[PDB]
Amino acid sequence: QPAVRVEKAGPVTTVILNRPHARNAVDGPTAAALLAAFTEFDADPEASVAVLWGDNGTFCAGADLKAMGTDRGNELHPHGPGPMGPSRLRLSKPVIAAISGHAVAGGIELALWCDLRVVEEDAVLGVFCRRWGVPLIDGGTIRLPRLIGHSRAMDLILTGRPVHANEALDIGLVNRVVARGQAREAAETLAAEIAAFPQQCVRADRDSAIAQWGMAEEAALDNEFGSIERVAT
Amino acid sequence: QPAVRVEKAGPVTTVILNRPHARNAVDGPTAAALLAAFTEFDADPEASVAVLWGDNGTFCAGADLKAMGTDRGNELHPHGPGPMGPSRLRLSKPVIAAISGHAVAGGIELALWCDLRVVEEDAVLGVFCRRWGVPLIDGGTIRLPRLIGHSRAMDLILTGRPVHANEALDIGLVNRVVARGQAREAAETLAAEIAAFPQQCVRADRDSAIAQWGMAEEAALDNEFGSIERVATEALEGAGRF
Amino acid sequence: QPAVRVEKAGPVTTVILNRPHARNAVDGPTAAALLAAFTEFDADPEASVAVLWGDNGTFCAGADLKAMGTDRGNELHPHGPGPMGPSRLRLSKPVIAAISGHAVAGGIELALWCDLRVVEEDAVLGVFCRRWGVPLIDGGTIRLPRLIGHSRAMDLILTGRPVHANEALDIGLVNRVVARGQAREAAETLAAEIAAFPQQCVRADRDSAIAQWGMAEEAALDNEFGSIERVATEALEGAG
Ligand SMILES: [Cl-]
Ligand SMILES: [Cl-]
C-alpha cells in the first residue's frame, strides 16, 4: 500500500510509484517520499543507476488534482524541491524512466528529468495540464526544448496534445520502445548495462553533458577537461 | 492592395502579407507595417493567438532585393527592430506561421520567429540568401540551431538548399503539413484550439520556454516557478471547474 | 607513410589521416600534425572549406590506446589544444567530415567538431570510450547535445552504443549518407559547392550560428547584426 517503494538488484535501484486509484498522481506526501528515495539513491555508494517505474499499468498522471487545494497538496518552494518531489534534484548518477500507460503533466516532467526514457508501445506522453490551466513548474519548460529542440517543444507545450510511442521515439522524446508490460524489465536491463561500465567515467561525462547547457563553448570545454582528474582519482 | 492587412476572427488575429509582384518580399515600408501589425496584436487584450499568412499562393521571399540601395530599402538597426520588421520582437502571445509557396531567406527567418509552422505539401523553405551573399540578420543563425539542433541547422545554413514539406516535418523545421490551399485555415484552426485553453497558463509556459535558452538550469527553474503567481487569478476564476 | 597529409584542389583542402596499422588512432605526434594542418588551412586565404578524411577504409578510432601511458601519448592541456589535436580550435572556415569505417571515441569527437558529416552506408559511429573507461575530453559532451538534442545525446554517451548510418542520418548525427568508398568524393563535392558561394557571407552566418550557443537571445541578435559590416566589401563586389 505504500505510495513509494524501493527495490534493489545489485547496483540498480528501482524507485516505484504505486497509487492505483489516483493513476499514480503525486500529492505532497508522495512527492516527499519520491524525494527521499532519490536522495538515498544519490548517497548510496553501492547504487550506480536508478530506474523510475510506475506500478499497475501507468507511469504518472502528474500532480494529484484531488489533493491540490488541501493539506495534502504539493508544496510550492521557490528554490526547490520541485512540487513533484525530485524534479529539481541534480543527481550525481543517472536515472531511467520506465513508462507504461500515461506520463502526462507533472508525469511527463518526471520523465524528462530522467536521463533516458523507455516506453511501452501503447504508452502516451503529453502536456495535459494545458487543458486544466496548471503550469509546468517541474522543469518541463526547460527540459523539453533542450531534449528535443525548441520547435517540437513548442508544439507539445502549446497544444498539450498526446504523443504516442512511435512519434515519441522518432522525435527523440523517448529513447526505447518496448512491448506492453516490458518497460520495467527493459529499463532495468539498460540500467544494468550502464552500471557495468567504469563508473567515474560515466559520471564525469554525464555531469559535463548536463552542466554545459547555457555555457559558452570555451568555458564548457574547460569544465569538460576536469573529467581527466575525476577518473584518475 | 495594401502590403499588410489584418483580419480578426474572435481571439485569433491573422496578419497577411500581400505583395504579388514581389512574391511577398518585404521592403522597408512593409517591414514597418508588419511591425505595427504585431505591436497592435501584442497590445490587444481580446487577441490571444496570431497567424502570419502570405496571400496569393506564397509566404515570403525575404528582404526585397529590388528595394536594396533605395530609400525603400530595409532599415538596419543595431539593436532592433530587425530588417524584416517584427523579427526581434518578443511577443507576449504566440504566432503561427501559415506557409504556402516559398518561405526563403528573410522569409524563413519570419517563419522561425513564429512559435509554430504549418506548411502546405508543395511549399519550400530555404536559406536562399546563401547564393545571394545576403547574410541572415533576422535571427536565422540563432533560431535555426535552437529549433532543430546545430547539425541540421549547419546543413541548411551552409548549403542554402531547398527543404520540402516532407523533410521539413521530419526534422522538426515545421510542425504540420496540410494540402495545397489549406495553410491559412489549418493555422487558424490550430490558433483557435490554443486560444481556447486557459491563456495565462499558456503564456506563462511559453514565456519560460523561450526565456530559459542560455540560462543556467537553476536560474531557469527559479524563473519557471514564477508561473504560479502568473496564473493565480485565472486559477481562482476557474476554481469551480477545477 | 606520413600519418597526416594534406591535398588541395582549388579552394578545398583535404586533411588526410593515415595510420593503417592503428585503425587511424591518434597519438600525440599525430594530434600535433592534425592541429598544424588545420592551423595552416585556417591561415590560407585561398582555402575556403576543409575536408577531414581517414585513409584506407576507416575514419578514426580515437586516441591511440597503445601510445597511451608513454611519451607518445596525447597531450593534456587544461585550456587547449585538445588531446585529439584540432578539437578545441575554432576555425574561421568550415570543415566537412568524410567518414568511412569507424568514427569512435575521439574519432566521433573529431566528426562532431566538423560542421557537417558525410558518411558511408556501412560506417559506424559511437562513444566506444564508454566501455574503455576513458572520458570524453575532445568536446563530445558539449557538441553531442547541441548537435542532436540532450535526449539522443545522453543515449549515445551513457550506452556507448554503435550507431549505423541510417540511424545516424535519421537523428541528425550525420548529414549525408553515400555508398561505400564514396565519402571522400561526396564530401569534396559538397565542400566545393559551399566554396562557390560568396564566402564572407558564409563565414559571417557560420560564425554567428556557432557563437550564439549559450548567449541570451538579445546579445546573440546584437552579435548577428555585425554580419552586415562583415560582408560590406563582398556585397559591393557582387552588386552588378
Ligand atoms: Cl524541435
Ligand atoms: Cl535528442
Q: What whole-number distance in Å separates Cα of residue C220 and Cα of residue C205?
A: 12
CA angle C86, C45, B155 (to 5 degrees): 60
* The residue to which cell 543595431 is assigned: B78
| DSSP for B9-63, written as a single string | ETTEEEEEE--GGGTT-B-HHHHHHHHHHHHHHHH-TT--EEEEEESTT--B--B
Q: Which three cell numbers stand for residue B45?
A: 487584450
With CB atoms and an 8 Å threshold, state whether A147 touches C149.
Answer: yes
Q: Contacts of residue B217 in chain A, CB cutoff 8 Å?
A: 90, 139, 142, 210, 213-214
Instruction: Provide the number of structural domains found in chain B.
Output: 2
**8 A C-beta contact, residue B158 and residue C94:** yes
Resolution rounded to one decimal, in angstroms:
2.1
Query: Domain check: are A190 and A206 in the same one?
Result: no
> Nearest 5°: CA angle at C106, between C26 and C114?
100
Q: Which residues of A82-115 are buried (b: 16+ CB within 10 A; e: fewer)?
A: bbbbbbbbebebbbbbbbbbbbbbbbbbbbbbbb
- Provide the 3-class DSSP secondary structure of residue B121: coil
The half-sphere exposure of B103 on its side-chain side, counting CA atoms within 13 A, is 31
Is residue A159 a contact partner of residue A139, using CB atoms and an 8 Å limit?
A: no
Cα–Cα distance between A105 and A124 in angstroms, integer? 11
Neighbouring chains to A with at least 3 Cβ pairs closer than 8 Å = B, C
Strand partners for A17: A4, A54
- How far apart are alpha carbons C212 and C221 in whole angstroms? 8
Question: How does DSSP classify residue C149?
Answer: -
Residue A232 CA, distance from chain mean position: 30
Euclidean distance between CA atoms B221 and A213, whole angstroms: 13
Q: Are residues A7 and A122 in the same domain?
A: yes
Q: Are residues A56 and A139 in the same domain?
A: yes
As given in the structure block, the three cell numbers for residue C68 are 597511451
Give which of A104, A125, A106 is closest to A30, Cα–Cα. Answer: A106
Residues B124 and B222 in one domain: no
Q: What is the Cα–Cα distance from B55 to B3, expressed in whole angstroms? A: 10
What is the rounded CA–CA span in Å between residue B59 and residue A193? 50
What amino acid is encoded at A110 in this protein? L
Q: Which three cell numbers stand for residue B86?
A: 517584427
The whole-angstrom separation of Cα A143 and Cα A84 is 15
Residue among A193, A217, A227 whose CB faces C159 most closely: A193
Q: Using a CB-CB distance cutoff of 8 angstroms, which residues of chain B are in contact with residue C195?
A: none
Q: Does B76 touch chain C (CB under 8 A)?
A: yes
Using DSSP, state whether C128 is helix, strand or coil: coil
Method: X-ray
**Is C173's CB within 8 Å of B157's CB?**
no
The dihedrals phi and psi of B121, each to the nearest 5 degrees, come to -55, -35
Q: Of B182, B197, B212, which one is at a domain's C-terminal end?
A: B197
Cis previous bond, C162, omega within 30: no
Give the DSSP H or E segment for C118.
Answer: strand C116-120
CA A190/CA C159 separation, integer angstroms: 8
Backbone angles phi, psi at A13, to 5 degrees: -100, 125
B47/B26 Cα distance (integer angstroms): 25
Residue C119 · residue C125 · CB < 8 Å? yes
**Residue B151 in grid coordinates:** 547539425
Cell digits for A6?
524501493
**Residues C189, C84: one domain?**
yes
Please give the DSSP secondary-structure letter assigned to residue B163: E
Residues A17 and A57 in one domain: yes
Put simply, the answer to whether C206 touches B157 (Cβ < 8 Å) is yes
Same domain, A117 and A218: no
- How many helices (H) and strands (E) chain A has is answered by 10, 9
CB distance A53 to A15 below 8 Å: yes
Handedness of CA A90, A95, A96, A99 (dihedral sign): negative
- The CATH number for A80's domain is 3.90.226.10
> What range does the domain containing B144 cover?
1-197
Say if residue B193 is in the same domain as residue B153: yes
Question: Which C residues, 16 through 75, put their C-beta within 8 Å of a C-beta on chain A?
Answer: none
Distance CA A77, CA A82 (A): 7
> CA-to-CA distance for C40 and C33, rounded, in angstroms?
11
CB distance A208–C148 less than 8 Å? Answer: no
Query: Do A222 and A107 share a domain, yes or no?
Result: no
Maximum Cα interatomic distance, chain B, rounded to a whole number of Å: 61
CA distance C206 to C215: 15
A17 closest CA partner among A60, A61, A48? A60
* Contact by Cβ (8 Å): B149, B174: no
> What secondary structure, in 3-state letters, does A85-131 show?
CCCCCCCCCCEEEEECCEEECHHHHHHHHCCEEEEECCCEEECCHHH
Instruction: With beta carbons less than 8 A apart as the criterion, state whether A66 and A21 touch.
Output: no
Residue B63's DSSP bridge partners are B26
Using only C-alpha atoms, what is the Rg of chain B? 18
- Residue C56 C-alpha cell reads as 584506407
The sign of the dihedral angle between the CA atoms of B234, B235, B239, B241 is: positive
Closest among A188, A157, A158, A189 to A173, alpha carbons compared: A157
**Pair B134, B203 in one domain:** no
Instruction: Examine the domain organization and report whether B203 and B138 are in the same domain.
Output: no
- C16 dihedral zone (left: phi>0; alpha: psi -120 to 50; beta): beta
Task: Identify any residues that bridge with A4 across adjacent strands, giving them in sequence order.
Answer: A17
Same domain for B132 and B241? Answer: no
- CB of A195 within 8 A of CB of A49? yes
Nearest to B144 by CA among B167, B171, B123: B171
